[PDB]
Design an enzyme around this catalytic site. Sequence first.
Site, PDB file in Angstrom:
ATOM      1  N   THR A  20     -36.211  36.234  52.408  1.00 59.36           N
ATOM      2  CA  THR A  20     -34.879  36.815  52.734  1.00 59.36           C
ATOM      3  C   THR A  20     -34.310  36.096  53.961  1.00 59.36           C
ATOM      4  OG1 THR A  20     -35.335  38.947  51.728  1.00 59.36           O
ATOM      5  CG2 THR A  20     -33.662  38.931  53.455  1.00 59.36           C
ATOM      6  N   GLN A  21     -33.040  35.695  53.891  1.00 58.07           N
ATOM      7  CA  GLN A  21     -32.334  34.954  54.966  1.00 58.07           C
ATOM      8  C   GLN A  21     -30.851  35.339  54.947  1.00 58.07           C
ATOM      9  OE1 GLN A  21     -31.372  30.783  53.542  1.00 58.07           O
ATOM     10  NE2 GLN A  21     -33.482  30.921  52.810  1.00 58.07           N
ATOM     11  N   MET A  29     -38.377  35.728  46.771  1.00 59.58           N
ATOM     12  CA  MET A  29     -37.484  36.443  47.727  1.00 59.58           C
ATOM     13  C   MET A  29     -37.173  35.544  48.928  1.00 59.58           C
ATOM     14  SD  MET A  29     -36.831  39.360  46.379  1.00 59.58           S
ATOM     15  CE  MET A  29     -36.156  40.338  47.722  1.00 59.58           C
ATOM     16  N   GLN A  41     -29.054  42.074  53.481  1.00 60.62           N
ATOM     17  CA  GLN A  41     -30.382  41.711  52.894  1.00 60.62           C
ATOM     18  C   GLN A  41     -30.145  41.091  51.511  1.00 60.62           C
ATOM     19  OE1 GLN A  41     -33.603  43.545  50.969  1.00 60.62           O
ATOM     20  NE2 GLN A  41     -34.108  41.412  51.422  1.00 60.62           N
TER      21      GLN A  41
END
Lengths: 233, 240, 231, 222, 235, 244, 195, 204, 211
Positions: free
Chosen positions: A1-2, A107, D1
Site C-alpha cells: 500500500t502506497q 497489495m 488506502q
Amino acid sequence: TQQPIVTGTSVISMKYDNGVIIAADNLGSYGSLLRFNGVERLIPVGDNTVVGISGDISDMQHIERLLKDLVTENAYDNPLADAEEALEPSYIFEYLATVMYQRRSKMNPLWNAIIVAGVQSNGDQFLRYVNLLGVTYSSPTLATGFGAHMANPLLRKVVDRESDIPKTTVQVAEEAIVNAMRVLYYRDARSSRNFSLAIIDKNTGLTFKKNLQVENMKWDFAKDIKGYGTQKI
Amino acid sequence: GYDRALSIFSPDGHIFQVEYALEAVKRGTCAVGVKGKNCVVLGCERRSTLKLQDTRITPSKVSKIDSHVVLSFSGLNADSRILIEKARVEAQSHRLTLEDPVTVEYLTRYVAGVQQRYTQSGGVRPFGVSTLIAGFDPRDDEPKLYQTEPSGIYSSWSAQTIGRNSKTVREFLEKNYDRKEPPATVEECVKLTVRSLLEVVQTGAKNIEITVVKPDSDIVALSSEEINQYVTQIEQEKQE
Amino acid sequence: NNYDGDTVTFSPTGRLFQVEYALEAIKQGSVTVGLRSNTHAVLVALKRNADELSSYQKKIIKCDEHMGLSLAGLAPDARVLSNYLRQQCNYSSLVFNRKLAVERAGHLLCDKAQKNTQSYGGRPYGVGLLIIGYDKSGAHLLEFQPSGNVTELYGTAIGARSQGAKTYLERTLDTFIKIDGNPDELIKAGVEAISQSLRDESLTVDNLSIAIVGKDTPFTIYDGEAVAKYI
Amino acid sequence: QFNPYGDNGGTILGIAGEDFAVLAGDTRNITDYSINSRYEPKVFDCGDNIVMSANGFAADGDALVKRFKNSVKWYHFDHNDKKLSINSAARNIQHLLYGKRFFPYYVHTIIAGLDEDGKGAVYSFDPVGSYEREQCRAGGAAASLIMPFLDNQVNFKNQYEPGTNGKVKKPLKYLSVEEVIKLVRDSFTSATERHIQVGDGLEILIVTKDGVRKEFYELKRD
Amino acid sequence: DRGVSTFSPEGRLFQVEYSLEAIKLGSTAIGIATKEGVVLGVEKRATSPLLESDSIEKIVEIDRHIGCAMSGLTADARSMIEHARTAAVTHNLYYDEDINVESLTQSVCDLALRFGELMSRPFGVALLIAGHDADDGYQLFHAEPSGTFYRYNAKAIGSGSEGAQAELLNEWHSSLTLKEAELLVLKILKQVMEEKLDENNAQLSCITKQDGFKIYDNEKTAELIKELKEKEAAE
Amino acid sequence: GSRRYDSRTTIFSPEGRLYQVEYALESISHAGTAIGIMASDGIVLAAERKVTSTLLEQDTSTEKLYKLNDKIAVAVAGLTADAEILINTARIHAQNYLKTYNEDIPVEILVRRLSDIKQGYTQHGGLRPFGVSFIYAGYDDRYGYQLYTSNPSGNYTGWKAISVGANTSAAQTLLQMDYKDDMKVDDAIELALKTLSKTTDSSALTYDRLEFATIRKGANDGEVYQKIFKPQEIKDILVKTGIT
Amino acid sequence: MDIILGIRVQDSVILASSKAVTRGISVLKDSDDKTRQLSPHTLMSFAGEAGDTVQFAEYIQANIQLYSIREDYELSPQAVSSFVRQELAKSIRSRRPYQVNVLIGGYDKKKNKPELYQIDYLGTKVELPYGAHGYSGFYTFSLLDHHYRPDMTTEEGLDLLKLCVQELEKRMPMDFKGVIVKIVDKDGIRQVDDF
Amino acid sequence: SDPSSINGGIVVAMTGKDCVAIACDLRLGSQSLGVSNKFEKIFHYGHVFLGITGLATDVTTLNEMFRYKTNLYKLKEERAIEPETFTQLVSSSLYERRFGPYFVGPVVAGINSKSGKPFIAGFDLIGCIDEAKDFIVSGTASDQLFGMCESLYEPNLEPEDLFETISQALLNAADRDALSGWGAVVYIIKKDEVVKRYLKMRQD
Amino acid sequence: TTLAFRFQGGIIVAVDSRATAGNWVASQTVKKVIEINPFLLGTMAGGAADCQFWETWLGSQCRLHELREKERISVAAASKILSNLVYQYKGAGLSMGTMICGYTRKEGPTIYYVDSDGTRLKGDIFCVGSGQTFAYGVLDSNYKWDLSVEDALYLGKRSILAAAHRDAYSGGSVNLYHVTEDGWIYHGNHDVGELFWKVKEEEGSFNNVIG
Ligand SMILES: [Mg+2]
C-alpha cells in the site's frame, strides 16, 4: 500500500487504417496541483511498440527500466532478435499486464495506467490498456485519466466501431489526437502545453515527435466576459 | 543436517544396517509372548550377572503404552525408550482425535512405521529393537499379540519369542502350544510362559519377570514369590 | 577408475566419467529417429516391450501444441525434463503470450542438465531427447544429451544401432529436406530411416510410434492402428 | 488506502437445453460512469466443449479463466488426453476459487456444456467457490432484472393451466435453441434499457455435440 | 564407500539394480487381467506355524476400483500405499470422479526415484496395481523401484517369477473368463510355492466393474482350491 | 566430495554393536574410579582423582563430583569437558521441571532425559557420542534414596552399590562381597573408601587424590543435605576408618 | 458456558457447573457437562469462549494422562494446577489466546487433604476454600463468606451449594438450566445423580 | 483494560540502621470483585527479597522465572546472589521483553552478606533501576505510599521502630485505595535473622 | 433452516433449499445435505462455500479412515475431524453451522452439532440457521421419543415449512432424510409452494393467511 506523489496525467491513443497513434504531455504534477515539466511518458520498445504511462513517475521510471531490461534479455542467445523473434506489442503488454496484476495481488501496486500501442509482425494494429488493478481492455480509441472523459468522446466521432478503422487515414487520426490534446490543455489543471506524439505505421515504421506545442487556441472571447452575472463593466 | 544414507542396498540385495540391527536384537535378553483364551502373558529374561541391583527403580522390561496395551522388547535398551515414548504420545493423540483408545493392531502398525522410516531416512541408523505388543481392543475380549522388528515388518502371533536363544524357546512353543485349544485360564497361560523361559533362563529366582494383561485395562505385574511358586511346581512335576 | 565415484571429480585426461556412464544408458535405450523439411518435423520411435504379455514403453511425450520430444534411456528422467519443458512452454504462454522458441527450449534443457554435472550429491540425467517443433522461424529438430550438449539438426537418431538410421539420413539429406506440404511422404522417409537400425525384429502395428508437427499441424502422436498405413 | 478490487460491470446468462447449452454475455466493459470498451469478450471457449465466464472485477475474471484453461491443458498431460467432463470442470473451479477464500476473486462464474449423457448443463459459482447445477442462471450487474423473467419464461413459474382454477401447473418442457436465443436476446435488450452498465453488444456461445458456435447481436450504445 | 545415485559403467543405477535383487527374495505375487475382471494372488509364506497367517496383508485396497499386491521388503510398501490412497481420494476431491489406473500408477512411480544425498535409498518392493476405469477398462500394471511401470495381460513377481511368467505366457488368451483366471493363479502359485498350497498360506482377490475390489475369504479360496485339484485329476 | 572423510559414527558392526559406543566405553575404563553406595538412611559418592600433581590446587577443585540440584548429585567418569556440557543440560532440565510443576524433579525423570540425549548421538547427527559415564545419587518423595548409572549408549539402570571407570570388575566383586541391605551411611562410607583403597593403581590412597560426598537426612526433620567433603574433612574420615 | 462453582470441605472438593449451552437466541442443550477428569483424583471444570473451552480441557486431559502412563504415577493437584497455569500464561501472549477460565478440584493422596485451585484465562492461579468464575462469584462469595466452615462434611458442603444455586436461580438474568455436581475425595470422582 | 490495575496491590521497602524492611498487601481482585485475601507479593531467593505488584499472572511468572535463574546462579557461582547483582538481573530480564513487557512493578530488598550494607531498589515494567537510600514504593496506591513515606520516614531507624513506620505507611496508603488491602505482611530483615509479621487491618 | 432429531425409528433430518445475498434470493434449489457415506449425513448452515467445500473434504477424510482402518468411521470421529479443522481456522471468518448425523453399531443413531467457533455438541434434537427458532417451536411442542417413522418424517417436514413461512431467509423446498441401521433413506424434495396449501387444507393450520 502506497500513495502517488509525482504523477503524469492522461495518455490518449487511437487506431487508423495502417497503424496506431499515441500522445502524452511532458508534465509531472505535485500535491496541490504544483507543476513540473520535462518528463517523457512515451517509452519506445524496439521499432514496432510505444508504451504510454500515466500515474506515479517513480513507478513509471521502474517500468521504463523493466522494458529496457526486457529488450536486453530477448537479445540473449537469439540470432533472430532483430527479425522473427523480435519483441511484439502483444508480448510487451502481456509482461506488463502480468506484473501489474501480481503487484496488486501483493497489495504493493505500481500506481500507473498504461497503454501499449504498436503494429504486430502480420501488420495487425495493437492497442490495449492495463492499470494498477491489472484490469485490461482493448478499443479502437483508448485514453487514461481525464483523456477517458474528454479525449475518447472526440476520438470515437472518428472511429466509433471496428469497421471505421479502414476508412480512417493517418492525416485524420493525427488531427483528431492533436485537437484532443488542446481540449485537455483547456480543461485539465494537471496538463501542459508541451506534449510528445508517436505514430507506429506498418508501411512507414515508428515516427516519434517530441517538443510539440498546442497551437490555434481560442482565448479572444475572454475579453467580452465581465463579472459573474450582473456586472456590466 | 547430517544427510548420509547409512541404510543402503548391497549387490546381493540385502540392507546390512537393518540385518546388523537384528544381530543387536539376538544379543538382547529373551522376551516371550503367549496369548490364552481370555488373556495374554508377557515373559521377560533378566541376566543374573548384575547383583547389587535396585529392582525398585531399575527400568522394568514391560512398558504400559496405554491402560489396555503393553510393549516388551529385545535389543538396545536406550533405543526401546524412543519407540515407547513415541507410542505413548500416539496413544493419547488417538484418544484426543478419534475419541477412542488405539486398537493393538493400530499401535503396532504405528511403531512398525517408525522402525521402517529409520531404514530409508538420511543420517539415521535403524532401531536395534524387536517389540512384542499385547493387549485387548476397546470393548473386545479377543486377545491380541503382535511382533515388530527393525525392518518395519509386523504380524500377529498365537505365541512368539525374541532375543537370545529365542530359537530354542520358539521350538518349545511350536510343539507345546495347541491352536485348536489355547491355555483356557490365566494360571495355564502363565505356567506355559514360565515353562518356555525355564528352557533358556538358568535359575527361576530374580531372573524371570511376568506381566498378565486381561480385558478392560486389567494389567498386573507378578512379584518374586508369586513367580517362584510356578518355578517350584514345574520342577517337581519334571522329576518323573 | 579412481575418478568415476561422483560428478564433481575430473579424470587426469579431463573427463567426467559419471557423465560418460549416463551417456552409456542412452546407447542401451531403444532406437528413435528425428527428421524435418521446411514445413514439417517428424519423430519416429521403436517402442520396447518387457515380454509378449507386457505393453510397449511409450517413447514420445507432447510438451506444447507446437513442440514435443522422443526419449532413449531412463524414462523417469525424460518425465522430469519433459515436465520442466511443459512448465517453460507454459510460462512463455501465460507471461508473454508467446510460443517458446525451439532454440530457447534447447538452451533451458542444456542449463538444467549442466547443474547436475557440477554439484556433489546429485547425478547426471540418464536420457537423450530428440525435440521437434514449429515456431516463428519454421520447423526445428534438436538433439539433447545429458552432458548438456544440445544441437540443431536437419535429422538424427539416438539409441542402440542408431548409426544405421543416421547414415541413411546423411545420404537422403537432399531428398527429405524438400518434402514440403506432404506429411505422409516425410513420415515414410522417417520409417525407411529407422528400418536401417532393425535386426531380426521388424516394424509391427503396436511396435511403431510416430509424431508430427508443422505449419497447420499441431504436435500429434500416432500409435496402434493409426500407424498401420506406414508398414 | 489502496483498494485492490474494482467493478467492470457487464452481465452474463447461461441456459441449458435438452441436447445443447448457451452462455451469453454483453461486450461492454465499464469503470464508474466511463465506457472502457464497447467490445471486450468475457465468454470464452476453454476446450473440451466447456464455455466459461467470470463476470465482476475483470482482472480477477481474466486470472481465473486463464488458470482454468491451464487446468484443462494439464489435465490432458496428466491423464492421457482424457476429456474433462463438465461436472469435473465444476469441482476443479470450486478449488481454484476456495484457494483464495481469504483474498477472493471478486467474480460470479458460470460454465456451460454437455454432461456425460449428452444433455445440456449449466453450473454457477459464488466468489469463494460454492457451486450448483442449474437449468437457468443470470450473473453480474443486471442479474436481478433477468433472473425472475427466466423463472417465468424457462421454468414456467407462477404460470397455471387456463380453466383449472390454478390447481394444474403449466407443464415443464425443454426449449429449442431458436426459442432459447429469443429469450436471451429479449433478456439483454430489456436489461440494456434499465441498467446503465449493460449495452453495446451481445455475444452468445452455443454448445452442442458438434462443438462451439458463436452469434453476435448489437445492443443500444447509450 | 560410494554415492547413492551413482551410475555403473554399463549405465544402470547401482542402488536400483541392488533393490531388484531384494524383490527376487520376496514371496510370489501373480496378477491376470481379463474382460470379466483382474485377479490378484499372493504367497503368504509364514516364517513359523505360531504366526497367525490372516494377519499377513500382502493384498491391499487403494480405492474401490484399484487393488494392489506387493513382493519384496513389504514394510517399504506402507508409505507407497498411503501415497496411492491419498492420490486416489485427493483426485476424487479435485475432479469429482474415479482416478485412471495408469494415472494412480504414474503417481506411485514418481516416489520411486525421489532418493539420494528425499529418502536415503530406493524402495525394496515391487507392486502389481490392478484396477478398472471407463476409458481403458480392466488393467494390470507392474510398478518397479526404478520409477518404470509396464501394463501386462498377466505378470508374476517375487522368488518364483521367471518360472511363473513362462507358464502365464502359454496359458493366457484374450477370451479368459474370471473363474478360469482364479484357477490359473492358484494353479501357478501351487507350482512355484515351497510349502503345499491351502487357504491359509495363499490369498486370492479380484477387481470387477460391478462389485469393485474384494479380498476373497479363506472359505471361498478353499472351494476354488478343491475345484482346481478335481479338474487337473479329470484329465 | 565430503563422503570420503565421514567416519559414520552412528552405524552397526556385522555383530550388531555400535563401534563408537564400544570405543567410548574403552575410553571410560581408563578414567579414575567412581563408587556409589546406597544405604537405608543416605547415599555415598566416592571418586579417585586422575594421578594428582603436588602443585595442583586441591581445595578449590571439582573434577569428579558435581551438584545437579539440592537433592541430586553425579559422579563423573570419562572426559570432564563432555560431562560439563551434559551437567549444564541436566541442571536446566531440573529447573524447567520445577518452573512447570512447582515440585523438585523426580530422580529417574532427570536420568531418563540425560540418557535420551546420549542415545540421540548414537542414532543420528553423525557426531561422536559423549565419552562419559555418570553415577546419579539423588532423593525424591516417591522412591526415596536412589542410585543410577548412564553410559555413552544412553542405557541407564538402578543400583544398591555400583562403580564406573577403572577396575570396575574388581570394585564390583568387593562391593558384592561386603554390601548388605540394612547398612547405615557411616558403614557405607567405610565400604566406599576400603574398595577404592584396594582397586587404586596408586601406591597408597591419600586425601589429596579423593573427592567425597554424602546425601543424608542429617538436617532437622524430613529434609535432605548434600555434603561435598572439604580436603581436611576427607583427611579426618580417612584417619577415622584407619586407612592412614 | 457461564456458571462454575467450587467448595473445598474437610475431606472432599465439590464442583458445580451449569448445564445450559446458549448460541445466539436459542438454548441448544440443557445437559452439558463442563468438566474433564484429568486423573482419578483430579477434576477440572471450565467456562469461556465457545470451542476454546473443550479444546483446552481435552488438551490438558491428554497431557496429564500421558504423564500418568510415562511415570506410572498420579501427578499431585498442586503439580497439575501449576502445569495448567503455565499453559494459560503462555496462551495470553500468543497470536490467538485461549479465553478459558478453570477450577481444578483434587484430593492429594500423599497429604490426605482436598485442594481447590481457581485459574483465569491470564494464568492467575489462587488456592481457595471456595471459588467461582465470571458473574457467579458476585452472589456466592458473600453467601460462602457467611456460612462456610473449614470442618464441614460433604453433606453440609452440598447443602451450602444448594443455597448458592437457589440464590443464582433467583437473581441471575439467564436460565443456566441447573448444575451437574461432582465430588472429589480419597475414593476418586463420583457425580451426584439428582440436584 | 489497563493490565497494571486489574488485580491491584502494593509493595513498599525501607532502609534502617543495619536493617531493611519490605511489606505488601494480600489482596488479589478481578477489578471490583475481591477474589483472594492470601496473595503474598513478596518472594525471597536466599537472603535477597523481591516484591512484585501489577498483573498477577506476571507476578507468579516472574517469581518462577527468578527462582529458576537464581537456582542456576548458585549452582555455577557456588554462593547465594547478592542484592546489587540480583537488581541487575531483574533489569536485564525485564528489558529483554522491551516491546512485549511484563506488566509489573518489582522491588528488591536485602543486606549485602559481605559489606553488611542495607540495599533497596525499584523498577518500571521495562527494567529501569531506581536505587534509593530512603524508600521504594510500587502498585495501585504508589501516590499514597509516596506521601506516607516522604512524611513518616527518617534515616537510621532501629528494626523495632522501622517496623512501626513501614507498617503505618502501608496500612494508611491501602485504606485510601479501592484495589489494595485485605491484609498485609511486613518482613524485618537483619544481617542474620528475618522476622515476618501479619498486620491486622480493615477488611473492606 | 435445518433440523435433525433422534427417536425410536432412528434419526430424522430435514432442511430447506434457499440461499440469499442480502435481500436477493440467490437460489431456491440448494442441496443442504451432504451425503458423505451411506450411514453419514451432514447439514449446511451459514456460508454456502465454507459448508459445501469442508463437508465434501470431510467425505474424503472419512473414506481414507475406512481404507486405513478397514472399518466405517464413527459419527464421533467424523464430527471431531470437522470441529478440529474449523478450530485451526478460528478467527479467520469461516461461517458454518452444522450437524453430523449417522448410525454405527457401537454408537447407535448419533447427532453432533459442529460450528465455526469450534463448538462440538452431542444431542437428541438440534435446529440450526436463521429459522431455527421457528423450527424449534413446532418440534419441541409435538416431539415424543416414541413417534412413528411416518409421524416423525411429517414433523420434520412440518417444522421446516413453519420456518420457511416465517423466516425471510428460509424457503424453496423441503429435503427429507431418515437414518436407520440399514443406512440413510431419501424421502423426496417437497416444494413449499405446493406443500404449504396442501398442509393448510389437510391440517386446518395457517389461519393467519388469506382463506
Ligand atoms: Mg482498602
